[PDB]
Design a protein around this ligand. Sequence first.
Ligand SMILES: O=C(CCC(=O)N[C@@H]1O[C@H](CO)[C@H](O)[C@H](O)[C@H]1O)NCc1cn([C@H]2CO[C@H]3[C@@H]2OC[C@@H]3n2cc(CNC(=O)CCC(=O)N[C@@H]3O[C@H](CO)[C@H](O)[C@H](O)[C@H]3O)nn2)nn1
Ligand SMILES: O=C(CCC(=O)N[C@@H]1O[C@H](CO)[C@H](O)[C@H](O)[C@H]1O)NCc1cn([C@H]2CO[C@H]3[C@@H]2OC[C@@H]3n2cc(CNC(=O)CCC(=O)N[C@@H]3O[C@H](CO)[C@H](O)[C@H](O)[C@H]3O)nn2)nn1
Ligand SMILES: O=C(CCC(=O)N[C@@H]1O[C@H](CO)[C@H](O)[C@H](O)[C@H]1O)NCc1cn([C@H]2CO[C@H]3[C@@H]2OC[C@@H]3n2cc(CNC(=O)CCC(=O)N[C@@H]3O[C@H](CO)[C@H](O)[C@H](O)[C@H]3O)nn2)nn1
Ligand SMILES: O=C(CCC(=O)N[C@@H]1O[C@H](CO)[C@H](O)[C@H](O)[C@H]1O)NCc1cn([C@H]2CO[C@H]3[C@@H]2OC[C@@H]3n2cc(CNC(=O)CCC(=O)N[C@@H]3O[C@H](CO)[C@H](O)[C@H](O)[C@H]3O)nn2)nn1
Ligand SMILES: [Ca+2]
Ligand SMILES: [Ca+2]
Ligand SMILES: [Ca+2]
Ligand SMILES: [Mn+2]
Ligand SMILES: [Mn+2]
Ligand SMILES: [Mn+2]
Lengths: 232, 232, 232, 232
Amino acid sequence: AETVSFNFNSFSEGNPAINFQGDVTVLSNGNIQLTNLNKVNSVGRVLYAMPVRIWSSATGNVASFLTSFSFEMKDIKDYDPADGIIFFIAPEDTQIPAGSIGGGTLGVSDTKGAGHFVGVEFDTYSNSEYNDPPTDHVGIDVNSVDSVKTVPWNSVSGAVVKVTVIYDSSTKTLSVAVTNDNGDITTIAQVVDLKAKLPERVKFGFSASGSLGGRQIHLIRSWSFTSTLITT
Amino acid sequence: AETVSFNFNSFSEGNPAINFQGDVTVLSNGNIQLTNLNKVNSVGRVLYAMPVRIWSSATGNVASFLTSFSFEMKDIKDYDPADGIIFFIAPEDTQIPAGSIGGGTLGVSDTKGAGHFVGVEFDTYSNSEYNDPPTDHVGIDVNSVDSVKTVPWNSVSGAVVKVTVIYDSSTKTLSVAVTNDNGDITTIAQVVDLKAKLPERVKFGFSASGSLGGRQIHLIRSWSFTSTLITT
Amino acid sequence: AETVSFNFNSFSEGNPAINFQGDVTVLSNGNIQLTNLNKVNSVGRVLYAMPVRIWSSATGNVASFLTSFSFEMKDIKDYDPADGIIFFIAPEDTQIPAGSIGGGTLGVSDTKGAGHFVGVEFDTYSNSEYNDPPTDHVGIDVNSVDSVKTVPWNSVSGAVVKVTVIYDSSTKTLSVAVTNDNGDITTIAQVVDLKAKLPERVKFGFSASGSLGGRQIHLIRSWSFTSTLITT
Amino acid sequence: AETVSFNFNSFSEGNPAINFQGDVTVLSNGNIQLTNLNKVNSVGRVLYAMPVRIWSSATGNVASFLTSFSFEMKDIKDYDPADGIIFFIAPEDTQIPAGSIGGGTLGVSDTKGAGHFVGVEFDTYSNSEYNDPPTDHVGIDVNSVDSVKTVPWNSVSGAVVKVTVIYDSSTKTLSVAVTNDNGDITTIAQVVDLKAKLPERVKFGFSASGSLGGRQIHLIRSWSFTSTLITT
Ligand SMILES: O=C(CCC(=O)N[C@@H]1O[C@H](CO)[C@H](O)[C@H](O)[C@H]1O)NCc1cn([C@H]2CO[C@H]3[C@@H]2OC[C@@H]3n2cc(CNC(=O)CCC(=O)N[C@@H]3O[C@H](CO)[C@H](O)[C@H](O)[C@H]3O)nn2)nn1
Ligand SMILES: O=C(CCC(=O)N[C@@H]1O[C@H](CO)[C@H](O)[C@H](O)[C@H]1O)NCc1cn([C@H]2CO[C@H]3[C@@H]2OC[C@@H]3n2cc(CNC(=O)CCC(=O)N[C@@H]3O[C@H](CO)[C@H](O)[C@H](O)[C@H]3O)nn2)nn1
Ligand SMILES: O=C(CCC(=O)N[C@@H]1O[C@H](CO)[C@H](O)[C@H](O)[C@H]1O)NCc1cn([C@H]2CO[C@H]3[C@@H]2OC[C@@H]3n2cc(CNC(=O)CCC(=O)N[C@@H]3O[C@H](CO)[C@H](O)[C@H](O)[C@H]3O)nn2)nn1
Ligand SMILES: O=C(CCC(=O)N[C@@H]1O[C@H](CO)[C@H](O)[C@H](O)[C@H]1O)NCc1cn([C@H]2CO[C@H]3[C@@H]2OC[C@@H]3n2cc(CNC(=O)CCC(=O)N[C@@H]3O[C@H](CO)[C@H](O)[C@H](O)[C@H]3O)nn2)nn1
Ligand SMILES: [Ca+2]
Ligand SMILES: [Ca+2]
Ligand SMILES: [Ca+2]
Ligand SMILES: [Mn+2]
Ligand SMILES: [Mn+2]
Ligand SMILES: [Mn+2]
């Protein structure tokens, strides 16, 4: 089998294993800060630099994967704590959408909320234009920030959040477990056919955005990943 | 919400938080050893002593859970490396089946392979009587060691194996990710309705067994768990 | 710290983690075959596709690394069993030298034997033009196939050879242990300053070559690697 | 060429291939447990029972060696996690020092920290009396627990640690690569003249110790070794 495996306990500028897009910076403590607090419609994204072959047009086989990551969102004075973080999967050529308005697009979609990606969003602002639920939520996204499914959640300012994601290729199930600061777990799961929605070669990563009035600290603290694709 | 949370980095026999059944021992290094290498049809099981409420007859709500554990199976001289370990969920009064033959029953079922439990098995011996696949496998079990579903796997002697399990109550999906020695990940997922198959209060644990000619070292190294049941 | 880790138990065409250069083919059993047995001056090379940051111009720190691989060289009828395999480190833009004569150049150097690379060679033909010792040898190469140091060795046709390499950044020591078919070990070690000889970002890989009369089967069976760079 | 080669995937009490010294026990899972958790100044050691000819008095030749082993250190309640494990080389008659205080001596030296041995220590307690660095470390020891050289390291409780050691006789270089749980590699290398510091035949092994307050689980899980001495 063909396996991609990596582990990030911290990050650094100049690591060729990571692609930095837009307003991303690396802090002295090793955290990735995705948005620029002094910029309007800030968008920042980090991708694992090596494309991952999630399915093969030759065999028809689809990869399974296990990934864990930790993040932190923290309020800043005067601005609305917005807009959130999205763990996403997209074609290997993926770039921040041209003329991105940031905000509710989470740096992955156009103004209408459409894009070419699969993702798990940690949404901290209710955008009526994307049919967002009224509270903070975890959502499963398939080519749109108008989520296929959401679950109520609570983004606590300054809290370290732990996420575990399992994609089971045979059932096409994307399962997510979110470990909150109050000790409770939040789960969400959805059948998503990655072979039907995405090309063979993809990139994995994180994106976050803000607006003129909606800004917060978006931090990626750690990321581990393993994908395995059965080969002929 | 109602949350049960625990973490075992090590295990000890004086700790009332675990119930010990059958031939199980705790080694001085802190590991749980489920079977006795010198006994015919050895069966050893371990359960978290406190019953966990997984669903409510009042609200109809079912808990979600995230659990991770690590185990090790190691070959012993002159014996077939058998039979395997099962992570299981059973009614709170669960006991080793009376007159257990161990072996392919994995200490949770009768001779016909039937029992009252939901489990994830790490099977290392092909029992034709339980329609086992020809190789080592991970199976999702619902009241039978004749698995609802299996996935090929490889039990590497002396390797530390890491497992992550997500149960998403809304989709009723039990998703499993197993991290092997060769670096590959193996996943298996199955829709299992816990309300329909198990009582409101259950015990979680591990079981392993052997036969006259089938024996191996079965070890539980660590276990973390979090369940959350919505009470509104 | 910044760590790069990978493990290849087998190889496949289409794996984005591997760059194929020249006459390389992947066999149905998963082995990489580096040279074409029917081509004059055949050269084949495989590289890990991601550039590896081996030193930082910001901190002055140099990475340490541990790598293991298994290869096989097998005689073919009538041709001289030549020329061997080189495990090498080179600038990220590395290509087979233009107008390569293959042969004693091992696909990494020009006709005079000069190139931009650091390598461990498994040399099976004595090239007087590169001051080769009279027998098969393991050599440490610094920008030349005229080795800084060599040790007598024996390339056994059809034998699986295991190699372990340690690069200790603090002492700048490259240490090699070669495990033969007859059970004996061969070692060679050399102080090589990678920060002085190579750029910050590099590619790691394997190269092999042949000539008109010098041809043999050159196989790469497995490859594991871990590098760690202290960050500040 | 005179070669010594062995492989231990597990260990057993009834095997004359290993010499057991002091408080050492074999657990039912096959691991060697070096210290007794209920004893003051506990010292336990294991040696490969056959002496290894590391050098010739006839030719003046010195052996090269390649060795790999895996170990585990685990914290125990109410005791300081101390003192660590040493992989050592000593005269064939080597015994635990008479009236050993255990602790910082690592079971290989006297109260002043002096002994007759060459070793690689995995030291988890800072002994100012042996000029230990302030954190956990890997050290290269020559007749003293006051290390010739150290490198900062981190002993993770319950983690399986893999070590690879290369001794290159021509450069007299002892190179060590330590693979941690967080994925990082730690290396240390030192020129050590084995012919000048040790006798013709030596014993290879492992030692660990504790004190009244400093105690932890010290486990040896596996050990492979190959040495080759050129006889021509
Ligand atoms: O000061 C106070 C009271 C302070 C306070 O805490 N008061 C508390 O009151 C309590 C009881 O109420 C208690 O008494 C308590 O003791 C007391 O302390 N209010 C007055 C007040 C404060 N802002 C803030 C909050 O919301 C406004 C303003 O600052 C940011 C935000 N904005 C509004 C706008 C206007 N553009 C637009 O609507 C067009 C574009 C637009 O909305 N894009 C969206 O902007 C979002 C962010 O708002 C997202 O990023 C979206 O994704 C993005 O699409 N752009 N940015 N607006 N009005
Ligand atoms: O020696 C060799 C070849 C060894 C070898 O390495 N050969 C190598 O081959 C190489 C090339 O291939 C090379 O040539 C190499 O040079 C050469 O060394 N075979 C001859 C041989 C060896 N056993 C072993 C393996 O299987 C047998 C025997 O030892 C264990 C097992 N059992 C079972 C019994 C007693 N029954 C019963 O209890 C009957 C009921 C029964 O089968 N319950 C099941 O028993 C299982 C375990 O077998 C499971 O636990 C099941 O869950 C359980 O239901 N009693 N024993 N049986 N026959
Ligand atoms: O048949 C036998 C004895 C066989 C045998 O088993 N004899 C046994 O002896 C026993 C007792 O000892 C018993 O009596 C037994 O009964 C008897 O059977 N020799 C007569 C004989 C055989 N070739 C062979 C070996 O070497 C020659 C020939 O086949 C291959 C090679 N090449 C080379 C060429 C074309 N040049 C060039 O390309 C010139 C440039 C050149 O030399 N580049 C180098 O070529 C190398 C490869 O040779 C390397 O690849 C170098 O890196 C490369 O730089 N074209 N060919 N040349 N002459
Ligand atoms: O409880 C606490 C804080 C616990 C804690 O978690 N605090 C947390 O702090 C957090 C924020 O920081 C939070 O606030 C949190 O809420 C709070 O819980 N300290 C008070 C405290 C605890 N021991 C421990 C640690 O060190 C002592 C004690 O237990 C073991 C050790 N020993 C030693 C002895 C007996 N001597 C001798 O034998 C003298 C000779 C001696 O020192 N040979 C050396 O002993 C070593 C081992 O200590 C090595 O083995 C050396 O190789 C050996 O040479 N007898 N005992 N000594 N003093
Ligand atoms: Ca939103
Ligand atoms: Ca040559
Ligand atoms: Ca110490
Ligand atoms: Mn949303
Ligand atoms: Mn050469
Ligand atoms: Mn020390």
